[PDB]
């Protein structure tokens, strides 16, 4: 669904309501617990969110651009073509990028739904390409976007973001981009819904410096020693003078929110039976997050460069990192503009500013606890909290909370609201969660623990309950892959929820954080090791060893297949003994190829999308052994991606990417 209208407040004007917004959202949250705290026996509803990028192929010029001119698609799919969507069980909404689409099923899946995830993902995609073909008929007749061919691709990263000729707007630099003030992204990369340029502007003003994301450059025989795309400019002070100071030799420099929030992911959200199981599930999924990031890697290039990393995470982390240099415990790059390293923080609250170790977009900070295996000593890392919020969640007359749950919320509330509408400044806290949502939705982490609304009282059985969002997955090109990875986590969640008396997944948080750094390394999946529990079926045991992704998926004692997946499949009767029995299942064959694809990637038998892209660039005739992705390499890569998406093996690319057995299989068998 399309986002409702508002008048955003810009940072200088909105910062004055930070405490008001925090206070009133805490009250809203208290009403939610008071109303929905005792929900129970909620069904296992779940659903995915896919994010897409609309790419314009200029086949005559050999240039694939991002398409920032067909964003009406989102309004039309939510207006006069919404009937198409509803009939087809899909729903569409905006994302940060003006070229992006997001789509979900219109109703959650319930329990195990087989091939229907993939069916539903194919329908989302077929409806987007339908709309796009309609525009191509209109444009033809109005003689517009002549030569151009727009295709939705589930890319994690656009390899040429912020590089010359990367958007289908002639001469986008003939005006200034006051929102991001980036050297590379015109503000047309941003979706027109006012929230998005608001967040962009708000986060930069608060920080008092452009966002800054330095990603290690892959080092080839002829790679420049610096990011030679940086340039001096004079539109904006201080921002146009930052790059010289902020960049680093051997690092890709990115300076704008769209480099991160202009990237895409797969997400899956699950409803637990009640809040307690929701805490248990959340805690248990914490170390799956860095593992699945590493496993799904789909981002080996940024801003026209091959990177020495394989996932998007740290780039998105920096893109919305509103921390002043004070909060980061570093000097302002330009002390004359960034007064005392406080950026846009009001002086009459600079005395309350904390040093905060992680960006508001970062891995989970705290186990919620509240289950039998939990011990507060597993929360062993630096996690600042808003003490006032903790105090109030502990002592109040609506819903006093246990200390571990209170500390989760209090950590979330160390942040300021960065997107605030004038209209919404005073709410009815009994019925509204908008203020709480303000902070909740702008703490972006590897999981999200989702309260219901005040409306979701236990008697109302169909309301959304206590939910856990699983956020780390990179998005893959094929709907077959995304459904494989969606069902994977489904089966892991069902496993956790089913065997909850016996699964101890606790490890020290400091280890998870370390895993998150390791998951970024180039080819991590193929050789790096990760702290993973030695056993899950052991009261009090929180011993880890360091296991490869292959061992983490396949070890009999602690592996995802033998301890999570296979046990749930036996238990639900899909198999007697082993997951591989599905190959010869009459009802369940596709589930076999889903799992086989996963296992073969986890063992290094099939490449990740990140590796496939990297090979593609490195093996390209025009590649100049210097780390650069040119318009021409970009064009061929994305043509390949278009063929892969569409199971087009005419050039053997699908066989090359999925191997013969899976390729032949998806080419001859449609999900149904």
Ligand X SMILES: CCCC[S@](=O)(CC[C@H](N)C(=O)O)=NP(=O)(O)O
Q: Note whether 443 binds ligand X by CB under 6 A.
A: no
Alpha-carbon distance of 449 to 451, in angstroms, equals 7
Q: Note whether 48 binds ligand ADP by CB under 6 A.
A: yes
Radius of gyration of the chain (CA): 24
In 3-state terms the chain splits into helix, strand, coil percentages (rounded to 5) of 40, 15, 45
Asked if residues 505 and 287 have their Cβ atoms less than 8 Å apart, the reply is yes
**Which residue number, 158 or 270, has a Cβ lying nearer to ligand ADP?**
270
Strands 45-58 and 100-105: antiparallel
Length of the chain: 672
Alpha-carbon distance of 259 to 62, in angstroms, equals 23
Question: Of these, 49, 310, 322, 365, which contacts ligand ADP (CB under 6 A)?
Answer: 49
- Binding segment for Mg ion (CB under 5 A), chosen from 261-269, 281-289, 391-399, 434-442, is 261-269
Q: Note whether 154 binds ligand X by CB under 6 A.
A: no
Task: Name residue 533's beta-bridge partners.
Answer: 544
Q: What is the DSSP letter of 464?
A: -
Question: Of these, 48, 49, 56, 283, which contacts Mg ion (CB under 5 A)?
Answer: 49
**Which residue number, 50 or 503, has a Cβ lying nearer to ligand X?**
50
**Which residue number, 265 or 389, has a Cβ lying nearer to ligand X?**
265
According to CB under 6 A, which residues from 107 to 126 bind ligand ADP? 108
Alpha-carbon distance of 64 to 622, in angstroms, equals 16
Q: Note whether 261 binds ligand X by CB under 6 A.
A: yes
Q: Note whether 46 binds ligand ADP by CB under 6 A.
A: yes
Q: Note whether 51 binds ligand X by CB under 6 A.
A: yes
Q: Note whether 96 binds ligand X by CB under 6 A.
A: yes
* Nearest-approach distance from CB 102 to ligand X, in angstroms: 6
* Nearest-approach distance from CB 40 to ligand X, in angstroms: 26
108 binds, among ligand ADP, ligand X, Mg ion, none (CB under 5 to 8 A by kind): ligand ADP
Q: What is the DSSP letter of 310?
A: -
Q: How far is residue 285 from each of residues 81, 132, 472, 492, 497, measured CA to CA in Å? A: 38, 38, 11, 9, 11
Question: Of these, 28, 63, 64, 104, which contacts ligand ADP (CB under 6 A)?
Answer: 104
265 binds, among Mg ion, ligand ADP, ligand X, none (CB under 5 to 8 A by kind): ligand X
167 binds, among ligand ADP, Mg ion, ligand X, none (CB under 5 to 8 A by kind): none
Q: Note whether 267 binds Mg ion by CB under 5 A.
A: yes
444 binds, among ligand X, ligand ADP, Mg ion, none (CB under 5 to 8 A by kind): ligand X
Q: What is the DSSP letter of 253?
A: E
- Binding segment for Mg ion (CB under 5 A), chosen from 49-57, 117-125, 167-175, 250-258, is 49-57
Q: Which residue is nearest to ligand X (CB)?
A: 265
**Which residue number, 266 or 478, has a Cβ lying nearer to ligand X?**
266
Cis-peptide into 478, omega within 30 deg: no
Alpha-carbon distance of 219 to 224, in angstroms, equals 9
Question: Of these, 90, 201, 263, 297, which contacts ligand X (CB under 6 A)?
Answer: 263
Q: What is the DSSP letter of 628?
A: B
* Residue 19 CB neighbours (<10 A): 13
Question: Of these, 49, 188, 321, 551, which contacts ligand X (CB under 6 A)?
Answer: 49
Q: Note whether 322 binds ligand X by CB under 6 A.
A: no
Alpha-carbon distance of 253 to 233, in angstroms, equals 15
* Nearest-approach distance from CB 268 to Mg ion, in angstroms: 9
Question: Of these, 427, 444, 620, 671, which contacts ligand X (CB under 6 A)?
Answer: 444
According to CB under 5 A, which residues from 92 to 121 bind Mg ion? 102
* Residue 588 CB neighbours (<10 A): 19
Question: Looking at 69-147, which runs of residues are DSSP E strands?
Answer: 90-93, 100-105, 109-110
How many chain residues bind ligand ADP (CB under 6 A)?
14
* Nearest-approach distance from CB 571 to ligand X, in angstroms: 31
251 binds, among Mg ion, ligand ADP, ligand X, none (CB under 5 to 8 A by kind): none
**Which residue number, 124 or 614, has a Cβ lying nearer to ligand ADP?**
124
4 torsion bin: left (phi>0), alpha (psi -120 to 50), beta (else) = beta
* Nearest-approach distance from CB 86 to ligand ADP, in angstroms: 14
Cis-peptide into 84, omega within 30 deg: no
**Which residue number, 92 or 665, has a Cβ lying nearer to Mg ion?**
92
- Binding segment for ligand X (CB under 6 A), chosen from 261-269, 380-388, 460-468, 509-517, is 261-269
Measuring CA to CA, which residue among 594, 566, 584 is closest to residue 666? 594
Alpha-carbon distance of 403 to 544, in angstroms, equals 27
Q: Note whether 267 binds ligand X by CB under 6 A.
A: yes
Strands 100-105 and 266-271: unpaired
Q: Note whether 105 binds ligand ADP by CB under 6 A.
A: yes
**Which residue number, 108 or 325, has a Cβ lying nearer to ligand X?**
108
Question: Looking at 416-574, which runs of residues are DSSP E strands?
Answer: 447-450, 467-470, 529-533, 544-548
Alpha-carbon distance of 71 to 486, in angstroms, equals 27
Q: Note whether 227 binds Mg ion by CB under 5 A.
A: no
Which residues contact ligand ADP by CB under 6 A?
45-49, 104-105, 108, 269-271, 464, 467, 469
Which residues contact Mg ion by CB under 5 A?
49, 102, 267
């Amino acid at each position: 669904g399309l986002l409702a209208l508002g008048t955003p407040l810009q940072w200088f004007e909105s910062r004055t309501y930070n405490e008001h917004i925090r206070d009133e959202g805490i009250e809203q949250l208290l009403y939610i617990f008071q109303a929905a705290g005792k929900r129970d026996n909620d069904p296992l509803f779940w659903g995915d969110e896919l994010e897409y990028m609309v790419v314009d192929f200029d086949d005559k010029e050999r240039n694939s651009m991002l398409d920032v001119c067909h964003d009406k698609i989102l309004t039309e799919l939510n207006m006069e073509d919404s009937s198409l969507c509803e009939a087809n069980d899909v729903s569409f909404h905006p994302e940060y990028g003006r070229y992006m689409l997001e789509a979900t099923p219109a109703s959650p899946y319930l329990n195990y739904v087989g091939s229907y995830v993939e069916v539903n993902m194919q329908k989302r995609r077929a409806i987007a390409e339908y709309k796009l073909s309609e525009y191509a008929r209109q444009d033809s007749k109005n003689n517009l976007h002549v030569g151009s061919r727009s295709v939705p691709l589930t890319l994690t990263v656009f390899p040429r973001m912020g590089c010359p000729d990367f958007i289908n707007i002639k001469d986008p630099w003939n005006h200034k981009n006051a929102a991001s003030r980036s050297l590379f992204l015109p503000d047309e990369v941003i979706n027109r819904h006012v929230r998005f340029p608001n967040l962009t502007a708000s986060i930069r003003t608060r920080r008092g410096e452009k966002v800054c994301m330095n990603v290690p450059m892959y080092k080839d025989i002829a790679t420049p020693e610096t990011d030679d795309s940086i340039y001096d400019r004079d539109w904006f002070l201080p921002e146009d003078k930052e790059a010289k100071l902020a960049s680093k030799p051997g690092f890709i420099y990115m300076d704008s929110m769209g480099f991160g929030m202009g990237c895409s992911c797969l997400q899956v959200t699950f409803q637990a039976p009640n809040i307690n199981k929701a805490r248990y599930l959340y805690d248990a999924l914490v170390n799956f997050a860095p593992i699945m990031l590493a496993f799904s890697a789909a981002a080996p290039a940024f801003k026209g460069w091959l990177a020495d990393q394989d996932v998007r995470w740290n780039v998105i982390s920096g893109a919305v990192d509103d921390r002043t240099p004070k909060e980061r415990g570093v000097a302002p790059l330009l002390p004359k503009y960034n007064k005392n390293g406080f950026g846009g923080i009001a002086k009459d609250v600079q005395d309350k500013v904390l040093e905060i170790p992680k960006s508001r977009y970062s891995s989970v900070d705290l186990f919620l606890g509240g289950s039998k295996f939990f011990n507060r000593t597993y929360n062993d890392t630096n996690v600042p909290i808003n003490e006032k919020v903790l105090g109030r969640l502990l002592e109040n007359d609506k819903a006093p909370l246990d200390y571990d749950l209170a500390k989760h919320f209090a950590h979330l509330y160390i942040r300021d609201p960065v997107s605030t509408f004038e209209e919404l400044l005073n709410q009815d806290n009994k019925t509204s969660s908008n203020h709480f949502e303000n902070i909740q939705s702008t703490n972006w982490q590897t999981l999200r623990f989702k309260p219901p609304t005040q409306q979701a009282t236990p008697d109302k059985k169909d309301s959304p309950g206590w939910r856990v969002e699983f956020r780390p997955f990179e998005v893959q090109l094929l709907d077959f892959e995304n459904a494989a990875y969606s069902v994977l986590i489904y089966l892991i969640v069902d496993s956790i929820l089913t065997f909850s008396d016996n699964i101890n997944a606790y490890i020290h948080m400091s280890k998870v954080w370390e895993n998150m750094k390791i998951a970024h390394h180039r080819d991590a999946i193929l050789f790096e090791k990760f702290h993973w529990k030695k056993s899950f079926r052991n009261d009090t045991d929180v011993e880890t060893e360091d296991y490869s992704i292959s061992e983490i998926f396949h070890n009999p004692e602690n592996g995802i297949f033998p301890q999570f997946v296979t046990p749930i499949l036996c238990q639900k009767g899909f198999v007697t003994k082993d997951w591989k029995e599905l190959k010869h299942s009459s009802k369940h064959e596709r589930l076999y190829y889903y799992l086989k694809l996963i296992s073969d990637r986890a063992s290094g038998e099939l490449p990740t999308t990140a590796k496939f892209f990297r090979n593609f660039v490195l093996q390209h005739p025009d590649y100049k052994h210097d780390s650069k992705i040119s318009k021409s390499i970009n064009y061929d890569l994305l043509s390949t991606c278009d063929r892969l998406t569409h199971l087009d093996d005419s050039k053997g690319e699908l066989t090359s990417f999925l191997g013969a057995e899976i390729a032949e299989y998806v080419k001859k068998n449609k999900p149904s």
